[PDB]
Write a protein that binds this ligand. Sequence first.
Ligand SMILES: O=C(O)[C@@H]1CCCN1C(=O)COP(=O)(O)OP(=O)(O)O
Ligand SMILES: O=C(O)[C@@H]1CCCN1C(=O)COP(=O)(O)OP(=O)(O)O
Lengths: 328, 321
Amino acid sequence: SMVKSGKARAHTNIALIKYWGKADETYIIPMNNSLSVTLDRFYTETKVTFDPDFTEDCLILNGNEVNAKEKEKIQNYMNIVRDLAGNRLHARIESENYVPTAAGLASSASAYAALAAACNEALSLNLSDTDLSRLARRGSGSASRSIFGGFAEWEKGHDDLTSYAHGINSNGWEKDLSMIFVVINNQSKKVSSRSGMSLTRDTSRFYQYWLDHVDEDLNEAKEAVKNQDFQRLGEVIEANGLRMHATNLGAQPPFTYLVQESYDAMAIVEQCRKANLPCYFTMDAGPNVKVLVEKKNKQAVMEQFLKVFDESKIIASDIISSGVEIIK
Amino acid sequence: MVKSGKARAHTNIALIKYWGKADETYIIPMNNSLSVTLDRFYTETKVTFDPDFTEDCLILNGNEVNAKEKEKIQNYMNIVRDLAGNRLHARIESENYVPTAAGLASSASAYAALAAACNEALSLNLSDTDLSRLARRGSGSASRSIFGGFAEWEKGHDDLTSYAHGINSNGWEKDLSMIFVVINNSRSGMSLTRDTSRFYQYWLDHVDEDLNEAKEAVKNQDFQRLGEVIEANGLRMHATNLGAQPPFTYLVQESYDAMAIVEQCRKANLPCYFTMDAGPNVKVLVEKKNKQAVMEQFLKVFDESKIIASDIISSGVEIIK
Ligand SMILES: O=C(O)[C@@H]1CCCN1C(=O)COP(=O)(O)OP(=O)(O)O
Ligand SMILES: O=C(O)[C@@H]1CCCN1C(=O)COP(=O)(O)OP(=O)(O)O
């Protein structure tokens, strides 16, 4: 009778125009806008239960305790929630990732968007989509975008109030598109995108080059979406993604997320283009290659990869039209 | 009635990179380049023109050359026949003094030595300029190996104007060394990149400024200043390949491991700077006074057999005998 709960499902998203580097490390304010598509196949379901008897926040992930470290980090995030709601209630958070994390797919975007929405629901905060995006953003930058379906854009702003995402209307175009995930063999050594982007943003000799072109890329991609022009969107996003990886090469000292196998998959995309199967690739904080393709060519493109790659390593998802949702 | 000559040329490493051709037929580059010539790695080549020879023969390290190289040699020798004004075919006996199967060895020392050997054999008395032009026709990088120490290849605009020259640094080269880090996993890569790379314009926009900064650092013997610009330039070159259609890279994780050690050395008062060519090997420029200290840092991580140092040689291509 004194316990408040809410549960939400939020889907992962992949940046076509990259978020890479922060203006503000504390509040997670980015150096540039980003543009993403939200994936139907992969998502996180998160329940939060607030109870006055709880003395601290507890996080249960895929049925298992998290270590004292994750627990510490989740408690700090929930302080933001408590401050926002004006209460001192602690919560038990029970989360399930339905994201291929072992295969290298990121879950922080769906995780924080799900948590943000679940809290809004549990506490009856009535946050707008803008304020939900802002709350999610404090947990993970890319989470700001997972509040939304289809195409979404993160507006960088200049502070906590002005940095947030919104959904882009594409006249239903997202329903015609898909993404193929090529799972690429990589080392299982620890990697962090927050840490990588910070080293690059602070020291990279090629970071200015990234900054000088990103707005142009973004405008070009947005214009391509307004026109449902697949080739035009693809060319700029593929180039934007490669420029992002270029910046890491200029870091002090340099680094890369790509491995030879990543390059083999890229070669396959170009082969597909020359054989009249339009598609374009992007890569994130890892070697996995993501292939944007029109839904009607999804299978034809997949068969080309399935010549080279194990069946288990080629995973396609549609792009979902709806945004974060409240569930049982 | 037999004409023979022998020459030794040393490999050189581009500090400001040659990457991309304006003209594929005459090997004219999109930009100037700046290299240092190495003491340790070289090619000795003997050429013999026998009227009784009907076809060009290349024996390399006691063995015969593959089909692609053989064809390349016969095409190149035609240029030499044309220049000389004879029709003599030649037996070429060439020896590479480099560590075996380590990704070293260079078209640069090979064609520079071949050019000088022919020059000697046929008594052409070519000026250094025209000798660099002849070497250029075999391999662009060979234009620079005619010289020792620092050398610059001036791109010019045709066969006559595109050649290298040696740079006088008042003996500065005697104070410098280069450490090779051998790591396991160009005309074709640079071709794809020059023709298709989405980032090639970025390369062209900055190369001339890098070159000037590099040449000015050399006049002042300013190691840190030279090092910083050449490291950035090297990395921009590999960036261009990332934007190629489709993208490719010469670097592997261990290449990045070596670069990280260079960075730690700098932070430990041991100035040194890296560069990479058309492969994963990392080359580290360092002053002689710090060579051993920097090598010790590498030997903490890499095997001794993989860490190979060379001085920068002051003299240029050289006739043997
Ligand atoms: O997907 C993204 O938006 C960008 C573009 C390329 C990959 N990437 C990332 O890895 C972003 O990783 P995040 O977990 O959102 O970083 P934080 O804000 O520090 O929490
Ligand atoms: O060393 C060089 O000067 C450049 C800079 C980076 C690497 N590199 C090369 O691989 C040049 O290789 P080359 O055999 O001279 O090229 P070609 O004129 O087509 O024969």
